[PDB]
Design an enzyme around this catalytic site. Structure first.
Site, PDB file in Angstrom:
ATOM      1  N   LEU A  11       0.804  -1.215   0.000  1.00 58.47           N
ATOM      2  CA  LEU A  11       0.000   0.000   0.000  1.00 58.47           C
ATOM      3  C   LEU A  11       0.838   1.267   0.000  1.00 58.47           C
ATOM      4  O   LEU A  11       0.343   2.324  -0.405  1.00 58.47           O
ATOM      5  CB  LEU A  11      -0.922   0.036   1.228  1.00 58.47           C
ATOM      6  N   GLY A  12       2.080   1.184   0.456  1.00 61.86           N
ATOM      7  CA  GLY A  12       2.948   2.334   0.543  1.00 61.86           C
ATOM      8  C   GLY A  12       4.398   1.911   0.588  1.00 61.86           C
ATOM      9  O   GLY A  12       4.761   0.987   1.326  1.00 61.86           O
ATOM     10  N   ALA A  28      10.924   4.259   3.047  1.00 59.90           N
ATOM     11  CA  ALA A  28      12.370   4.218   2.849  1.00 59.90           C
ATOM     12  C   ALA A  28      12.987   2.971   3.469  1.00 59.90           C
ATOM     13  O   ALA A  28      13.828   2.312   2.845  1.00 59.90           O
ATOM     14  CB  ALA A  28      13.015   5.479   3.424  1.00 59.90           C
ATOM     15  N   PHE A  29      12.591   2.634   4.698  1.00 55.71           N
ATOM     16  CA  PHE A  29      13.112   1.459   5.383  1.00 55.71           C
ATOM     17  C   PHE A  29      12.005   0.541   5.882  1.00 55.71           C
ATOM     18  O   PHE A  29      12.295  -0.447   6.566  1.00 55.71           O
ATOM     19  CB  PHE A  29      14.019   1.876   6.548  1.00 55.71           C
ATOM     20  N   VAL A  31       4.351  -0.804   3.874  1.00 54.62           N
ATOM     21  CA  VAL A  31       2.982  -0.975   4.359  1.00 54.62           C
ATOM     22  C   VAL A  31       2.280  -1.923   3.403  1.00 54.62           C
ATOM     23  O   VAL A  31       2.232  -1.670   2.194  1.00 54.62           O
ATOM     24  CB  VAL A  31       2.232   0.362   4.460  1.00 54.62           C
ATOM     25  N   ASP A  37       6.560  15.823   9.844  1.00 59.27           N
ATOM     26  CA  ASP A  37       6.535  15.270   8.492  1.00 59.27           C
ATOM     27  C   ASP A  37       5.195  15.541   7.833  1.00 59.27           C
ATOM     28  O   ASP A  37       4.665  14.702   7.096  1.00 59.27           O
ATOM     29  CB  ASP A  37       6.837  13.768   8.508  1.00 59.27           C
ATOM     30  N   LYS A  56       3.093  16.533   5.133  1.00 56.88           N
ATOM     31  CA  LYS A  56       3.288  16.660   3.698  1.00 56.88           C
ATOM     32  C   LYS A  56       2.212  15.828   3.012  1.00 56.88           C
ATOM     33  O   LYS A  56       1.531  15.022   3.668  1.00 56.88           O
ATOM     34  CB  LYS A  56       4.704  16.216   3.286  1.00 56.88           C
ATOM     35  N   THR A  92      10.926  16.863   4.728  1.00 55.51           N
ATOM     36  CA  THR A  92      11.036  17.027   3.291  1.00 55.51           C
ATOM     37  C   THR A  92      11.316  18.486   2.972  1.00 55.51           C
ATOM     38  O   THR A  92      10.617  19.367   3.499  1.00 55.51           O
ATOM     39  CB  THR A  92       9.757  16.566   2.597  1.00 55.51           C
TER      40      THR A  92
END
Lengths: 65, 308
Positions: free
Chosen positions: B15-16, B19-20, B23, B131, B133, B172
């Site tokens: 689903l997502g 970076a590490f 999901v 975060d 965004k 970001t």
């Protein structure tokens, strides 16, 4: 997915079936633009113009589609 | 060892892409009920990365609010950690705006009201998200009018009261606050700066600070050098511009707070203050905004695989 990438390129191409190098340069950071310009083959399908780049061929090949 | 996730849940599609972490959708087999599993492979994590994983789990358990993704379960197996969330199925807010075609100030105000209530809740629990965004603003379902849900507390930190501190460079670039870019001590106001950036984008579909040169971007942010150019801003209400100005205030101590912004007339009196005019150029721009974001991630990954 390849579908999302193609659709995104198409958006930056103003819904044309191809994209132009100058559109990649306007819309993307320079190194990303040049990476795409170097690897997108010439578009020769319906409505092609000189300099037309085949973002769909590039994207499909990238993901084996 | 514990294999409770492996035994009781089935994993499905991604689903997502984190970076590490990843999901994936999952189903609790006994109940048939769907959830989202945020999965971290803990085999080769540093001591610092374990601490950050444990911090995120703590914060996720702490936060309970209608506009924040809700943690359902947390499971530690031998080489993996699972944060199981109630599944939200409406996708990213910015994608939904484009898909549903029509968008006005009134829509943006109702959206940002929900975000501010989520942020207020975080701050009242001593949590700074750091975060805020577009990727972290989801919709609860595909229902027309579905609630906004704040997601992804991977960068969130715990603060003590109003105490400011240097909690590090994280976030970001386009959403970073002047105080963080100056390496000043910071706290809750960084979320309100990010809210101002998001609100600006919700109104005209492009960001207030943008530059290919990240060093130039950061100078522009630190100078508060945004603009309300014609023609698109000519139809934006004065009250919407005022709220943006108060969020994009470079002095964090003078910046509007979440509680104060919830009382701002463009939010609190949306029905009489916010414009109902459809802003076609906003949706048009948002469509390109979302496409640039996708292609940035795809092209940067392709370039990385080329360098090898």
């Amino acid at each position: 997915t390849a579908e999302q990438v193609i659709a995104s390129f198409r958006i930056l191409a103003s819904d044309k079936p191809y994209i132009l190098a100058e559109e990649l340069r306007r819309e993307l950071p320079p190194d990303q633009a040049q990476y795409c310009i170097k690897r997108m083959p010439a578009y020769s399908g319906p409505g092609s113009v000189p300099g037309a780049l085949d973002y769909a061929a590039f994207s499909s090949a990238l993901y084996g589609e | 060892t514990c294999t409770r996730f492996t035994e009781e849940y089935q994993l499905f599609e991604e689903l997502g892409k984190g970076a590490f972490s990843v999901v994936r959708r999952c189903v609790k087999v006994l109940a048939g009920q769907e959830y989202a599993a945020k999965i971290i492979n803990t085999k080769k994590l540093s001591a610092r990365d374990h601490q950050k994983l444990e911090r995120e789990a703590r914060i996720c358990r702490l936060l309970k609010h209608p506009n924040i993704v809700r943690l359902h379960d947390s499971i530690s197996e031998e080489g993996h950690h699972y944060l199981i969330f109630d599944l939200v199925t409406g996708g990213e807010l910015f994608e939904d705006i484009v898909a549903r075609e029509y968008y006005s100030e009134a829509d943006a105000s109702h959206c940002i009201q929900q975000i501010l209530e989520a942020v207020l809740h975080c701050h009242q629990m001593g949590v700074v998200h750091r975060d805020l965004k577009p990727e972290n603003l989801l919709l609860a379902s595909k229902l027309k009018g579905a609630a906004v849900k704040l997601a992804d507390f991977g960068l969130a930190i715990e603060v003590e009261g109003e105490q400011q501190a240097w909690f590090g460079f994280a976030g970001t670039p386009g959403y970073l606050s002047p105080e963080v870019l100056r390496k000043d001590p910071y706290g809750k106001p960084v979320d309100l700066w990010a809210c101002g950036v998001i609100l600006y984008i919700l109104l005209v579909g492009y960001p207030p600070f943008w530059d290919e040169d990240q060093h130039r971007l950061y100078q522009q942010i630190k100078a508060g050098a945004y603009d309300f150019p014609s023609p698109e801003w000519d139809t934006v209400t004065p009250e919407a511009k005022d709220l943006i100005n108060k969020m994009l205030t470079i002095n964090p101590s003078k910046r509007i707070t979440a509680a104060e912004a919830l009382k701002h007339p463009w939010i609190s009196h949306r029905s009489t203050v916010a414009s109902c005019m459809h802003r076609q150029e906003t949706v048009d721009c948002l469509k390109k905004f979302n496409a640039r974001r996708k292609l940035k991630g795809a092209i940067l990954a392709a370039m990385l695989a080329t360098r090898n």
